[PDB]
Amino acid sequence: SGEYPTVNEIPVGEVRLYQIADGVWSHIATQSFDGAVYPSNGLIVRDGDELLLIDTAWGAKNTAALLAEIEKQIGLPVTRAVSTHFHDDRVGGVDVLRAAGVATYASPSTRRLAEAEGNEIPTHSLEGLSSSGDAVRFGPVELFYPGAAHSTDNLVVYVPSANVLYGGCAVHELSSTSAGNVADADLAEWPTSVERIQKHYPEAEVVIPGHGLPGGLDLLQHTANVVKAHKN
């Protein structure tokens, strides 16, 4: 009833949307992994009379439910999707999208990693993102490669019309006590990558993590802090 939806509030298989700003929503879904349940976020950005999707809803059935929820709540067609790294919370559901008419995109690095590890593979490669600090425009967003953090391929997304920074899994929520799933992370480079985000997007008003509650710019410093302490 208006609060940001949380893990125990979303059964696995259902999806909820949350209005972030004019023409910007997050999507929230839940999934089981190694016997625990987790929430995860993505983004939806209005692109005229179409929608740009950022990240899947962590699985094929969740992603079908996402498309249904978008049709219910927004009623504009999703035409393109970008996955912000190669893990299943970002690409699981790409096959569903691709069969529903959505053109799917990711960096070449993400595509290679997804292929190598047996995850679903976005169709189209996003060039111009291979060096830290690179940025490219993609419809109503800017895509930015900050350097290795949660993963070596992680991208962040900025919505300039609304000053919304979607950090994906490179950014943690304020309640986080740990650096999350660090299996593929670079804990040594992560603070430097966060510093690049902080420098590039000083006017961000909302910061959205890959999992958990949005907040303001403090999510970036908090992330750097928890990562440094995890490493320590």
Ligand X SMILES: C[C@@H](c1cccc2c(-c3cncc(O)c3)c(C(=O)O)[nH]c12)N1C[C@]2(C[C@@H](CN)C2)OC1=O
- Residues between 151 and 180 with contacts to Zn ion, criterion CB under 5 A: 169
Q: Which does 88 bind (CB under 5 to 8 A by kind): Zn ion, ligand X, none?
A: ligand X
Cβ proximity to ligand X, 104 vs 223, nearer residue: 223
Residue of 27, 62, 87, 222 marked active site: 87
Place of tokens 């985000």: 197
Binding residues for ligand X, rule CB under 6 A, total 13
Q: Determine which residue in the list 89, 145, 204, 213 makes contact with ligand X, applying CB under 6 A.
A: 89
Which H or E element spans position 166? strand 164-168
- 3-state SS of 106-159 is ECHHHHHHHHHHCCCCCCEECCCCCCCCCEEEECCEEEECCCCCCCCCCCEEEE
Cβ proximity to ligand X, 31 vs 104, nearer residue: 31
Which of 48, 121, 75, 86 minimizes the C-alpha distance to 210? 86
Q: Which does 33 bind (CB under 5 to 8 A by kind): Zn ion, ligand X, none?
A: ligand X
Taking each helix axis from N to C end, the angle separating 190-200 and 218-231, rounded to the nearest 10 degrees, works out to 170
Q: Which stretch binds ligand X (CB under 6 A): 44-52, 72-80, 97-105, 177-185?
A: 177-185
Q: What's the half-sphere exposure (Cβ side, CA atoms, 13 Å) at 206?
A: 21
Active site includes 181?
A: yes
Q: Interface residues with ligand X (CB under 6 A)? A: 33, 38, 87-89, 150, 169, 180-181, 183-184, 210-211
Residues making up the annotated binding site for Zn(2+) are 85, 87, 89, 125, 127, 150, 169, 211
